[PDB]
Amino acid sequence: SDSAINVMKWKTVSTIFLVVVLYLIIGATVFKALEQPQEISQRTTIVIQREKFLRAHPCVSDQELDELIQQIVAAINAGSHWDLGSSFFFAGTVITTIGFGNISPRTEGGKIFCIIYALLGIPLFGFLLAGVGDQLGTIFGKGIAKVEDTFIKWNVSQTKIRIISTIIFILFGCVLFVALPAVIFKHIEGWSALDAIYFVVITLTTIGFGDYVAGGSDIEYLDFYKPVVWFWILVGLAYFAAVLSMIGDWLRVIAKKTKEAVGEFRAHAAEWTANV
Amino acid sequence: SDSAINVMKWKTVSTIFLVVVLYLIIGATVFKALEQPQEISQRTTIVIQREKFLRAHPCVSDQELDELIQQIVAAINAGIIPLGASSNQVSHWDLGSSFFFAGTVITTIGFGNISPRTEGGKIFCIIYALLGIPLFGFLLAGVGDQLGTIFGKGIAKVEDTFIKWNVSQTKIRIISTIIFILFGCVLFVALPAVIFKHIEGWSALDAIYFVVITLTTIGFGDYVAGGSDIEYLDFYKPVVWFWILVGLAYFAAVLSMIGDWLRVIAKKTKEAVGEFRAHAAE
Numbered sequence A: 001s002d003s004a005i006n007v008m009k010w011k012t013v014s015t016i017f018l019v020v021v022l023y024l025i026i027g028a029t030v031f032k033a034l035e036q037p038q039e040i041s042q043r044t045t046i047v048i049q050r051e052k053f054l055r056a057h058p059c060v061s062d063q064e065l066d067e068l069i070q071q072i073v074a075a076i077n078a079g080s081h082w083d084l085g086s087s088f089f090f091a092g093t094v095i096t097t098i099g100f101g102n103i104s105p106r107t108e109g110g111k112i113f114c115i116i117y118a119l120l121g122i123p124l125f126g127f128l129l130a131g132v133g134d135q136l137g138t139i140f141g142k143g144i145a146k147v148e149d150t151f152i153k154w155n156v157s158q159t160k161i162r163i164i165s166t167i168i169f170i171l172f173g174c175v176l177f178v179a180l181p182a183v184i185f186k187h188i189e190g191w192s193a194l195d196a197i198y199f200v201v202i203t204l205t206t207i208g209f210g211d212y213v214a215g216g217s218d219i220e221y222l223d224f225y226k227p228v229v230w231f232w233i234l235v236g237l238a239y240f241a242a243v244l245s246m247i248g249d250w251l252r253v254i255a256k257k258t259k260e261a262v263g264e265f266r267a268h269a270a271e272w273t274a275n276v
Numbered sequence B: 001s002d003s004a005i006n007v008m009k010w011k012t013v014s015t016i017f018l019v020v021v022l023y024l025i026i027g028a029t030v031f032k033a034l035e036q037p038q039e040i041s042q043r044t045t046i047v048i049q050r051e052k053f054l055r056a057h058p059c060v061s062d063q064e065l066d067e068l069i070q071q072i073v074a075a076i077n078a079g080i081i082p083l084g085a086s087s088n089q090v091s092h093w094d095l096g097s098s099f100f101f102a103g104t105v106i107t108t109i110g111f112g113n114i115s116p117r118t119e120g121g122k123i124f125c126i127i128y129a130l131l132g133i134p135l136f137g138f139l140l141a142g143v144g145d146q147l148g149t150i151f152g153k154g155i156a157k158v159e160d161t162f163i164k165w166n167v168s169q170t171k172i173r174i175i176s177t178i179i180f181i182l183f184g185c186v187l188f189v190a191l192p193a194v195i196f197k198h199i200e201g202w203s204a205l206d207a208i209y210f211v212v213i214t215l216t217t218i219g220f221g222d223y224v225a226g227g228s229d230i231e232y233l234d235f236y237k238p239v240v241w242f243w244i245l246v247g248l249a250y251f252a253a254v255l256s257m258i259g260d261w262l263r264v265i266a267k268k269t270k271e272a273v274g275e276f277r278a279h280a281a282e
């Protein structure tokens, strides 16, 4: 029965859908809980700054200030960040689906070329990202081969070592691809320890908020700083690519433990019910 | 044999790397060619607006005036309505917008228009995405499967209609691939674009632009459906959410198709180069 297999699939999809919808509701409340207060204090202090500017300076009134604000808002639409170097940056953001968006095409023509460029670029880059990831994955293979002959054969059996190996991949991976670049971002880019990691994650996950852009701030980079972040991204995006895939498998493993843990809990409702 | 193929793989990756390097170069030159002129005309006229306002009031704090703008821009990263008229203010972290924000996180669209300002929200965003992204991955795959089978039912209808005697199985696949694109761009691109134009006030190009930038998960943020306050009947926002679920599913397959074409154009060109080397000399 073909429609029976499809009923099993829609049952699976529909539950995950709710888990997602539920995951959204939970997060939506946690963010508002965290961000709501700062918005009020920050939005109240900005109000004190308008009232203080007209009081401190009789020179300016409400008639000139509103006209001023209208010009700054328009300045948001504009912002050279389209020079040879920044555009090459823009292209990278386009084909990686990071899209920080701080610099986006404002021309009807640039919008058309961006569309085409993206549709052709993103798949192209995917092949590269696949090879880079494959290379890095095999490099990792040579490393664990050296480690699997030292202290794998000794005490603990090989059945539980696969758990130890996965921890090594995360340890080093976090150090090289997260820790080191975050350290560098802090000093060079001036970002706090947290803001550094925040950038690393929101970037290598292709989220790309744009609130933190390494090399985006306008002042004083080193000669080879920008080229090194490019390489970090090519290899960084591949790392989270695997990491995100691993976390995915953790979920399909767990999803079963909870699904049978619910069958257990119902079971010992069942017989516990018949013994009464 | 094991290490032989390894040496062979690096050969392919290195060539693709260079192709990408060259692809970024050509792109960079094409964007700055398009965007550089308008950047200049806008940056010269803005200087005209600052000079026009400098001599306007001799009693201004001249040098400290440019410091004020720095404070406004620094405040623009977060939602700010700094105007005397209509002091009433709408929250961008309310229950409805924060829900949106989470959707942008787990879909890796990241419009960035509204991002966490708090050290706590940032630490939760990290955890949220790391677990959220992979989770939403399964959903998108499930919605990819469902939407796919519903298509397999539709083509099973047309494959017995146009089918006649003396037909080839390999050539009909090209027909199906076209109808997939056709109806796809209609429902998930054409239809939503038109709605975006009227309801959201966007131009026909800005709507398509938004769609492509969004459903490819690029997420500039320069255009966001439902961003401005306007009215939003509320028959609208829920739809957009659904469109996103399926629209992301659609491009996922579309983008994966283009990759197959590129791979194809890759072999034809690679043997076309072997042909040209074979003969070409004469």
Ligand SMILES: CCCCCCCCCCCCC/C=C/[C@@H](O)[C@H](CO)NC(=O)CCCCCCCCCCCCCCC
Binding pocket: A015, A019, A022, A023, A026, A027, A251, A254, A255, A256, A258, A259, A262, B127, B128, B131
């Ligand atoms: C942290 C912010 C978000 C919090 C996470 C909210 C998740 C709430 C969902 C709880 C899961 C129980 C719901 C019932 C599910 C069952 O009908 C079903 C099989 O019957 N199980 C699954 O689908 C498989 C369920 C797979 C569960 C995946 C979510 C696990 C996240 C655990 C959160 C730990 C974070 C701690 C900080 C590092």
Ligand SMILES: Cc1cc(Cl)ccc1OCCNC(=O)c1cccs1
Binding pocket: A081, A085, A086, A087, A089, A092, A093, A094, A096, A098, A213, A214, A215, A216, A226, A227, A229, A230, A233
């Ligand atoms: C942060 C980042 C993202 C990608 Cl997708 C690729 C490379 C990259 O490395 C930083 C260098 N940054 C620049 O070169 C800039 C020019 C104009 C503003 S920043």
Ligand SMILES: Cc1cc(Cl)ccc1OCCNC(=O)c1cccs1
Binding pocket: B096, B097, B100, B102, B103, B104, B105, B107, B109, B214, B224, B225, B226, B227, B237, B238, B240, B241, B244
């Ligand atoms: C473009 C987009 C992307 C995702 Cl991932 C999810 C939803 C979404 O748009 C739909 C409704 N929009 C809202 O509910 C808003 C609240 C505040 C600004 S928009």
Ligand SMILES: [K+]
Binding pocket: A097, A098, A099, A206, A207, A208, B108, B109, B110, B217, B218, B219
């Ligand atoms: K993005």
Ligand SMILES: [K+]
Binding pocket: A099, A100, A101, A102, A208, A209, A210, B110, B111, B112, B113, B219, B220, B221
């Ligand atoms: K963005």
Ligand SMILES: [K+]
Binding pocket: A096, A097, A098, A205, A206, A207, B107, B108, B109, B216, B217, B218
């Ligand atoms: K993305």
Ligand SMILES: [K+]
Binding pocket: A097, A206, B217
């Ligand atoms: K992706």
Ligand SMILES: [K+]
Binding pocket: A097, A098, A099, A100, A101, A206, A207, A208, A209, A210, B108, B109, B110, B111, B112, B217, B218, B219, B220
């Ligand atoms: K983005």
